[PDB]
Amino acid sequence: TIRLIPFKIEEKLESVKEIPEGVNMVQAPEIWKEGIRGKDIVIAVIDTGCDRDHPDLKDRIIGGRNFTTDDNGDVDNYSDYNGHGTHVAGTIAATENDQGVVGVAPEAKLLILKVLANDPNNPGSATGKYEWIVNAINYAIDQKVDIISMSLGGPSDVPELHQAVKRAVENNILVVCAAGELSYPAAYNEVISVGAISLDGQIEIDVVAPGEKILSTIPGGKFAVFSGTSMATPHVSGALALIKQLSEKEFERNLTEPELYAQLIKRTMPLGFPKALEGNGLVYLTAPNLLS
Amino acid sequence: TIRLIPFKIEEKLESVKEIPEGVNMVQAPEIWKEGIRGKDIVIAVIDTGCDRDHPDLKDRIIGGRNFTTDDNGDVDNYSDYNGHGTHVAGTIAATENDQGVVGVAPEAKLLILKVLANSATGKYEWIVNAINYAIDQKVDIISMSLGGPSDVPELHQAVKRAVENNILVVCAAGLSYPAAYNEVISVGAISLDGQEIDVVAPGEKILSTIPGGKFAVFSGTSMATPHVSGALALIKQLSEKEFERNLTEPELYAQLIKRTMPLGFPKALEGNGLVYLTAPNLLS
C-alpha cells in the first residue's frame, strides 16, 4: 500500500497576510519580477485532495477527481479530510490577492487528484492503493498537465506504476516526488526526488527545498505551519512551473522533460553538504542570474 | 555525405609550452585542483583520425579504428592525414607532461574512430558504424565535430541507442545533423572575448596538437565541441564520485547545464551559456 510521507503540525492560525518564508527562500518573488508566475501551467497534485473553497485556492483549481473509496467512491468529491493536500496546494500556487499566503507559482492552475484516504492504522497520516496512484498518474497525462506532484511512497516496485511514470516523462511531463519503506515512486530514475532542509539552510535525491515550519493553507479557510520532508516537494513543483514558463519563453520553443530537468538543476544552490544529502543543492531560482 | 565544419588554420607552431586559452576559459585547471582530471573516462573521437605518436597524445589513446577506405580499409590504421582529428584530440585530453599543451581532461582516455578522409568527408555509413563501435566499446562520451545536411534516420537511431545506453553524444552545430537531433548536446562557439544550441565554448584562436609532434591554432565552430567533450569527462568523474553512484545520461546532461555561465545573449544564440566548470563553486 502507498502511504503519505510523515509530517508534523506545528501550529494552526486563523488569519495571516504574508509570503511564506519557504517561498522567499527559493527566490520565487525574484522570478515574479521577470513577469513569470506560472501562467497557463497545470500541476496535478496527487495527495489527500483539497479544500476547493479556500479563498487562496478557489481561483487556481481547474478540476479534480477522487480515486479513493471515500464518499462511496464518488469521483467528484476530492475533499481533503486530512489537511496535507490543501497545505501542499497552497505552497504550489496560493493566489496573490493581498490576503492569506502566496504560493511559488501563484498564477498556475491545479488538478486535484485524491488518492489518499485517512489511515486508521496511523492517525494523522493517509493511505492508498497502488492502483489508485497509477490511475491518477494516467489521468494526469490524459489531462495534459505539465507537472505531477506527489508526497507519498510505497515499498514495492510495481511495474504498472513505473510504466505510468515512464509514460509521463515520455509525454514531456515532469514527475516530482518526495523521498521519504516508502521508496517508490521517488526511487525511479525518471522521478525528480526531493529532500528537505530547514529555513536556515540546514538538513538519491535530486534537489532539496524548505520543509521546516512551512506556512500554508488548510481546510476551512485557515492556515497552519507544517514540518516534514513532504513540505519540500510543493516548493519544487511550483518552481518547475515558473521554470517551464520562463525557459520555454527564453528558448522560444517547447522544451523536452530532460531539458526542463536540466533547467531545474541549473537553478540550484550548493549548500556544502555531501551530494548524498543535498543532491544538487537548494532550489534557488535566480542562480544563473547571480552567475552572470 | 558527412563533412568537417569549415575552420581556419591561424598559425602553425613547431613547439609550445602552455595551457591553451580555451582550456583556461572553461575553468578546467580549477577542477584539476579538486583532484579531477578525467581518469577512467573514455571519449570516442569521431573525426579524421589521430597521430598516435604525438608526445601529448601517445599516453592517452586507448585504441582506435578506421572506418574509411584510407590505407586500404585497414581497420587498425587511424592515421590523421588532415590534422583536424589530432587537434580535437589535444583539446579533449592532451597529457600534462611539462611540455606542449594540456587538454581539458588530461588524464582521460581516447578512442580514435576515423570516419573522414581528405577539408574532409565521410559516408554516413562510416559514422554510424563508428557510433555502434563506440557503444560496443562502452565509452562514456562520443565527440563529433562534423555535420551533414541530411536527416538520415539511421544516423538518428544510432544517436538514440548511444543516449539510451547512457552515453553522452556531443556535436558541433554547423550541416545541421546530427547536432539538430534533440538527443545530441549541440555546441556553439564563442571568441575568447565572449563574443537550437545547448551550450557554447571557445572556438576562436584555439591552440592544440597536430600530426608530426607540432601544434596549430585553429578557429572555427567545431573547435568548441572538444572543449565540451573534455569538460563532460571532468563532470562525469566529479559527479559520480560526489553522488557516489553511476549517473544516467539525463543526470549528466543536467550536471553540464549546471556548469554554465550565461553571457547575456538570447538563449537562441548561446543556449545555456558558456561551459564554466566552477559555476556551482562560485554560486555557493
Q: Which residue of A has its CA nearest to B182?
A: A256
Cell for A104? 511559488
**Entry field: residues in chain B:** 284
Which region holds residue A177: left if phi is over 0, alpha if psi is between -120 and 50, else beta?
beta
Distance from CA of A281 to the nearest CA of B (A): 9
Which residues of A are annotated as catalytic? 47, 84, 230
How far out from the chain centre does Cα A49 lie?
Answer: 13
**Whether B243 contacts chain A with CB within 8 A:** yes
**Whether B274 contacts chain A with CB within 8 A:** no
**Entry field: residues in chain A:** 292
Determine whether the interchain pair B282/A291 forms a contact, defined as Cβ–Cβ distance below 8 Å: yes
**Whether A288 contacts chain B with CB within 8 A:** yes
Which region holds residue B182: left if phi is over 0, alpha if psi is between -120 and 50, else beta?
alpha
Tell me whether residue B246 is exposed, middle or buried, using C-beta atoms within 10 angstroms of its C-beta: 0 to 12, 13 to 18, 19 or more.
exposed
Cell for B1? 555525405
Asked if residue A92 lies in contact with residue A110, where contact means CB atoms within 8 angstroms, the answer is yes
**Whether B40 contacts chain A with CB within 8 A:** no
Determine whether the interchain pair A262/B257 forms a contact, defined as Cβ–Cβ distance below 8 Å: yes
| Alpha-carbon gap, residue A224 to B160, rounded angstroms | 48
| Partner A, chain B 185-204, Cβ-Cβ below 8 Å | 196
Continuous H helices in chain A: 21-25, 28-32, 70-73, 84-93, 130-142, 159-170, 232-250, 257-266, 275-278, 287-291
- Residue by residue, DSSP assigns B162-206 as HHHTT-EEEEE----BTTTSTTSEEEEEE-TT----SEEEE-SSE
Asked if residue A285 lies in contact with residue A271, where contact means CB atoms within 8 angstroms, the answer is no
Beta bridge partners of B185: B170
Residues of chain A contacting residue B241, judged by C-beta atoms under 8 Å apart: none
B202 cis-preceded (ω within 30 degrees of 0): no
Q: Resolution, rounded to a tenth of an Å?
A: 1.9
**Whether B181 contacts chain A with CB within 8 A:** no
The backbone torsions φ and ψ at residue B188, rounded to the nearest 5 degrees and listed phi first, read -95, 175
Tell me whether residue A33 is exposed, middle or buried, using C-beta atoms within 10 angstroms of its C-beta: 0 to 12, 13 to 18, 19 or more.
exposed
Determine whether the interchain pair B283/A276 forms a contact, defined as Cβ–Cβ distance below 8 Å: no
Distance from CA of B43 to the nearest CA of A (A): 22
According to the entry, how was the structure determined? X-ray
The backbone torsions φ and ψ at residue B35, rounded to the nearest 5 degrees and listed phi first, read 80, 20
Asked if residue A68 lies in contact with residue A128, where contact means CB atoms within 8 angstroms, the answer is yes
Beta bridge partners of A175: A148
Determine whether the interchain pair A291/B283 forms a contact, defined as Cβ–Cβ distance below 8 Å: yes
B84 is catalytic: yes
Which residues make Cβ contacts (< 8 Å) with residue B229, sequence separation at least 6?
Answer: B43, B45, B92, B104, B141, B143, B170
CB half-sphere exposure, A199, CA atoms < 13 A: 12
Distance from CA of B264 to the nearest CA of A (A): 7
| Alpha-carbon gap, residue A184 to B123, rounded angstroms | 46
Residues of chain A contacting residue B244, judged by C-beta atoms under 8 Å apart: 275-276
**Whether A252 contacts chain B with CB within 8 A:** yes
Beta bridge partners of A65: A113
Angle formed by the axes of helices A232-250 and A257-266, to 10°? 110
Residues of chain A contacting residue B255, judged by C-beta atoms under 8 Å apart: 265
The amino acid occupying position B199 is V
Long-range contacts of B186-194 (CB under 8 A, 24+ apart): B186/B271, B187/B224, B187/B225, B187/B227, B187/B228, B188/B221, B188/B224, B188/B269, B188/B270, B188/B271, B189/B220, B189/B221, B189/B223, B189/B224, B190/B224, B190/B263, B190/B270, B190/B274, B192/B21, B192/B22, B192/B25, B194/B263, B194/B274
Segment (H or E) for B8: strand B8-13
The backbone torsions φ and ψ at residue A132, rounded to the nearest 5 degrees and listed phi first, read -65, -40
Residue with cell 565572449: B194
Determine whether the interchain pair A269/B284 forms a contact, defined as Cβ–Cβ distance below 8 Å: yes
Domains of chain A: 2-291 (3.40.50.200)
| Alpha-carbon gap, residue B32 to B38, rounded angstroms | 9
Starting at the earlier edge strand, list the strands of the sheet with A222-227: A8-13, A222-227, A214-218
B222 is catalytic: yes
Query: CA torsion B44→B45→B46→B48, rounded to 10°?
Result: -150
| Alpha-carbon gap, residue A283 to A266, rounded angstroms | 9
DSSP character for A31? H
Q: Which residue of B has its CA nearest to A189?
A: B248
Determine whether the interchain pair A250/B257 forms a contact, defined as Cβ–Cβ distance below 8 Å: no
| B93-118 residues labelled b (16+ CB within 10 A) or e (exposed) | bbbbeeebbbbbbbbbbbbbbbbbbe
Q: Residues followed by a break in chain A, C–N over 2.5 Å?
A: 180, 203
Distance from CA of B271 to the nearest CA of A (A): 7
Which residues make Cβ contacts (< 8 Å) with residue B165, sequence separation at least 6?
Answer: B135
